[PDB]
Amino acid sequence: ISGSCKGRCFELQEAGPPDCRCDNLCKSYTSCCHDFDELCLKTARGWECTKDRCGEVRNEENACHCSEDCLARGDCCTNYQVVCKGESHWVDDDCEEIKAAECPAGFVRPPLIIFSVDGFRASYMKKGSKVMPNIEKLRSCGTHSPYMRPVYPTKTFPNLYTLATGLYPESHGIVGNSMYDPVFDATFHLRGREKFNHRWWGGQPLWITATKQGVKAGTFFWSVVIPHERRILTILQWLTLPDHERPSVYAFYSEQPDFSGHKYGPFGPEMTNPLREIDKIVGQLMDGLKQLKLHRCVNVIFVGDHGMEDVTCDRTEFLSNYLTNVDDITLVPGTLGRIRSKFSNNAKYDPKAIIAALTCKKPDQHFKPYLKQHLPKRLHYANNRRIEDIHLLVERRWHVARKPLDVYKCFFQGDHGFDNKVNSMQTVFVGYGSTFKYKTKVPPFENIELYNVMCDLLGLKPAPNNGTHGSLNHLLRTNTFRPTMPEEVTRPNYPGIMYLQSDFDLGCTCDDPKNKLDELNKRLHTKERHLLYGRPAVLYRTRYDILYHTDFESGYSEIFLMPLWTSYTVSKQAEVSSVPDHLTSCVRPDVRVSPSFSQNCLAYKNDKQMSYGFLFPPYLSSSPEAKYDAFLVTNMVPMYPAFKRVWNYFQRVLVKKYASERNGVNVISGPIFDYDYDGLHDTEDKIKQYVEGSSIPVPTHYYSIITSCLDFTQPADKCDGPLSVSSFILPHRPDNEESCNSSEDESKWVEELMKMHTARVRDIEHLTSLDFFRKTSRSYPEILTLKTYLHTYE
Numbered sequence: 001i002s003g004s005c006k007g008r009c010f011e012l013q014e015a016g017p018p019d020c021r022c023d024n025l026c027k028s029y030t031s032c033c034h035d036f037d038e039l040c041l042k043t044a045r046g047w048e049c050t051k052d053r054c055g056e057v058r059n060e061e062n063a064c065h066c067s068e069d070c071l072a073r074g075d076c077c078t079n080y081q082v083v084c085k086g087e088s089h090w091v092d093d094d095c096e097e098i099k100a101a102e103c104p105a106g107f108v109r110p111p112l113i114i115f116s117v118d119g120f121r122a123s124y125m126k127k128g129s130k131v132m133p134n135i136e137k138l139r140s141c142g143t144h145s146p147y148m149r150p151v152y153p154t155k156t157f158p159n160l161y162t163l164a165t166g167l168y169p170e171s172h173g174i175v176g177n178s179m180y181d182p183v184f185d186a187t188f189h190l191r192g193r194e195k196f197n198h199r200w201w202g203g204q205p206l207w208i209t210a211t212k213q214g215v216k217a218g219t220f221f222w223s224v225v226i227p228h229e230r231r232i233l234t235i236l237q238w239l240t241l242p243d244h245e246r247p248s249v250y251a252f253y254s255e256q257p258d259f260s261g262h263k264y265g266p267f268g269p270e271m272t273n274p275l276r277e278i279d280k281i282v283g284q285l286m287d288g289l290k291q292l293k294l295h296r297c298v299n300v301i302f303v304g305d306h307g308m309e310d311v312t313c314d315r316t317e318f319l320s321n322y323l324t325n326v327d328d329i330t331l332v333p334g335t336l337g338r339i340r341s342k343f344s345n346n347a348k349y350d351p352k353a354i355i356a357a358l359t360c361k362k363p364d365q366h367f368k369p370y371l372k373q374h375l376p377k378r379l380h381y382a383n384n385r386r387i388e389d390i391h392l393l394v395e396r397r398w399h400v401a402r403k404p405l406d407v408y409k410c411f412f413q414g415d416h417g418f419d420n421k422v423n424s425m426q427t428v429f430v431g432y433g434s435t436f437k438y439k440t441k442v443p444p445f446e447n448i449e450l451y452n453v454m455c456d457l458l459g460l461k462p463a464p465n466n467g468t469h470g471s472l473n474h475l476l477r478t479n480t481f482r483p484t485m486p487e488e489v490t491r492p493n494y495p496g497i498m499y500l501q502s503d504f505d506l507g508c509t510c511d512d513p514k515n516k517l518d519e520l521n522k523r524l525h526t527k528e529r530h531l532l533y534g535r536p537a538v539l540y541r542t543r544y545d546i547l548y549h550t551d552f553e554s555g556y557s558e559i560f561l562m563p564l565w566t567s568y569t570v571s572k573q574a575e576v577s578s579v580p581d582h583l584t585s586c587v588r589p590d591v592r593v594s595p596s597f598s599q600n601c602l603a604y605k606n607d608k609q610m611s612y613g614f615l616f617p618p619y620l621s622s623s624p625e626a627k628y629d630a631f632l633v634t635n636m637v638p639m640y641p642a643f644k645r646v647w648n649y650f651q652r653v654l655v656k657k658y659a660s661e662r663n664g665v666n667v668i669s670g671p672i673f674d675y676d677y678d679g680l681h682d683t684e685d686k687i688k689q690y691v692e693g694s695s696i697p698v699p700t701h702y703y704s705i706i707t708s709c710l711d712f713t714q715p716a717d718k719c720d721g722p723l724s725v726s727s728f729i730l731p732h733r734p735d736n737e738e739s740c741n742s743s744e745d746e747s748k749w750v751e752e753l754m755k756m757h758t759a760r761v762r763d764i765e766h767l768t769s770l771d772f773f774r775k776t777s778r779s780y781p782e783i784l785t786l787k788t789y790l791h792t793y794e
Ligand SMILES: *[C@@H]1O[C@H](CO)[C@@H](O[C@@H]2O[C@H](CO)[C@@H](O[C@@H]3O[C@H](CO)[C@@H](O)[C@H](O)[C@@H]3O)[C@H](O)[C@H]2NC(C)=O)[C@H](O)[C@H]1NC(C)=O
Pocket: 167, 168, 171, 203, 380, 464, 465, 466, 678, 679, 680, 766
C-alpha cells in the first residue's frame, strides 16, 4: 500500500516518491508516511514487561507486548521470558562454550549482528562489570583484544566506513567528517543532505557485498529519532521473518559514549551513566536473542570507531599567530588541520611560505606542518584529491584554528581525530558467538582487518581491501579462509666472480698486520646466520642478484642499481668498530655485477646536493678484512647529507642498542620509491629524481625490519618459537626540518624521529613488492599477524 504505512513498518523494500518510505531511514530523507510515527514508533508502557502485563490482552498501540501470542509474532519485550516464564537474564547465565552453532530450524547460517558504539575509549573497559555487566560478559566469554587501532583521522565517518569496507580513508574517499572535492566543487559535511549523495563513497561496503552475492543485508542505518530500544526490537523481529526473507547480517549504531564524552571529557565522573545505558541495550539484545533461542547461534561484534581525549578551548593554536595573512587560506580546523587556498585565481598564495611560517617557529608548538606526501607512511593519508597538500598533525589534547574570532560556544571537554597511534584514540573490539573463540584474548589489531573477518562469517568473498586476509584467523573457532603465500615472480641470479677489476671505470678509489691477528684468533680456539627467515620474494618482473658476504647478504637489483634488501644479524655481544680515515672515502667495485649495472662514484661527486650511505654499515664488520665488503659499490645507496645524520646514528648506535636489548637482532634494510605517494612500489617511470647525470634513482624512503625472538632468553638466530618485530619507514628528506631539535646532537632527536615513522612489515611490503618471513616454522596465519604488528611505543 502507498500513502499509508500499515503492514510496512521497517520494511526491507523500496519504491520511492510518491509511495511512502517506511524503512528506518525515511526520517533522514524527510519522506516517511503520515502514520509512521503512530504505527512504527509506538512507545506505550515503555520497553520492559511487568508482572501484571504478563498475559495481557494484546493492545495494538503498545511498544512491545507481553501476551502469550507475542512470541509467535516476535514482538515481545526482551524481558518477557524473565518476568513471566521464569527465565533468567542472559548475563546471569554461566559461560558455556559453543563448540557448534545451535541454531533453530530454517537457519542456513549463523546471523551476524554488528554492535557499533561512537567514541568508545578502550580504557572504558576497565570500569568493570559493576557498570557494564552485559558487555563485560561478552568480553570475557567471547573473543576480545586489549584495544583496537582506528584509522587516521580518528573521526566518526572515516572509521565507520573503514569498518564497512576494510579500506584506508584515502582509498574509499571518506577522508574526514567534512571534506572538499575539487572535481565536484562541493563540500561534504556531517550535518546536511550532501553526505547522502553516492558520489562521495567509494569501495564496496559490507551490505553491498552481501547483497551482490545473494546474502540479504537489511538496513544498517537508523535515523537518530528512532530510540535504541526500538532498533533492537526491529532487529529481533527481522530474525523471526521467513527463511527467504530473513537477512543474515545486522547493524546497530549508537551515538554514545561519544555524545556525553564531548560534554564531560573521557575521565569525567559523568561518563559512568552513558555506559550503563549502553549496557542496558546490549542486555536487551542478548535477552531478546536468548528469548529467540539464538544466543548460542548468532555472532555479535561489539566494536568502536575511535577513542576520546581531553581537550579544552584554552588549548587552541591559532594560525593568525604564525601567518602574516590568514584571509587568503581555508582551514579545516579541530583535532587536525588541512589548509587550501581560499581563492584559486591567486598567485600570491605560496604553499612553500605557509609550511615555512609554521615550521619550528615558536617553542612548545602544539602542531607540526606536513606536505601530505611527507606524513608518516603508516597513516596512509595522501593518495586522494580530497586531501589537501598542507596537513597539520595536531598534538594530543590540543586544537588548531584559523583565528580567535572563529572559535565560539567551552563548547566541549573532549574530542578525537589525532594521530591514530595515540593511546586515547584506541577503541574496543569484542567478538562473541558460535564462530568466535571461547574465553580467548587476541593481540590488538587495526580495524581495516575486520571486513575480511565479517565476510568470512557470512561466507562472502571480500572485495579487494587493505586488510591482510588470514591475519585474524586466530579470532575464529573455525576458519573457511586459508591464506596463500604469494609465489615468487623473479627468480634470483647467484653470480660468481665474472669480471676483473680492470673492467671497471666507475671512478671509485679505495686503498688496500690485522690478518695475522685475525688468524691468531681463529687458529687458537677450542670450539645462513644472516638470512634467518628465508630470502625475500620479489613479486614483480625484474632482474636482481643474490650477493653473499661474510657479514651480510643482499638482493642487488640490476634495474635500480642498488639492493632491494640487505640482511645481517647482530649478536648481543657484537662490537661496534670505527672506520680508518684512509677508508672513509673508499668504494670498491663488485666483480660479480657488470660495470653497466653498477653505480659510479663520479655521479656522486658531480651531484653537490647528494652523498651516499651503505645498507650494511662498515661500523659493524666482524673484521677489517670483511670490512672491505661493506665498501662494495653494490652496497651503497644515495643519501642526502642531512639524512646521513639519521642513518649514521641508526646504524652505528641504535642497532647495537637493539641487539643488546633484545638478545641480538636481524636487520633487513633497503630503499623505497613512492613518488606518487599511493603506498605502492613505483616502477621506473614514476621516479622523478635521480643522481645528477646518472640513472641512479633517489629513494623517497629507507626501511629496516628489526626481528628477534619473542622469548628473549634465546638469541635471534636460535629462536624456537614466536618472533618479535619492529620496523620503520624513514623519509629520505634533504633537510631535518621535521625535527625541531635537529641542531642538537643525534641522541636528542633522531630516535624520536624514528618512533614517529614506525611501520608494519606489511606497509614495507606494499612499498617494495617484496615478501618477508617465508621460511620460519611458524604457521602462515601467525606470520601474517606478525606482519600486521605496529610497534607504537604506547
Ligand atoms: C588498498 O586497497 C585498494 C583496493 O584493494 C587499493 O586500490 C587499488 O589500487 C589498484 C592499483 O593502484 C587499482 O587497480 C587499477 O585498476 C585500473 C582499472 O580501474 C587499472 O588500469 C590499473 O592498472 C590498476 O590495475 C584498484 O582499482 C584500486 N582499488 C580501489 C578500491 O581503490 C590500494 O592500492 C590499497 N592500498 C594499499 C596501501 O595497499
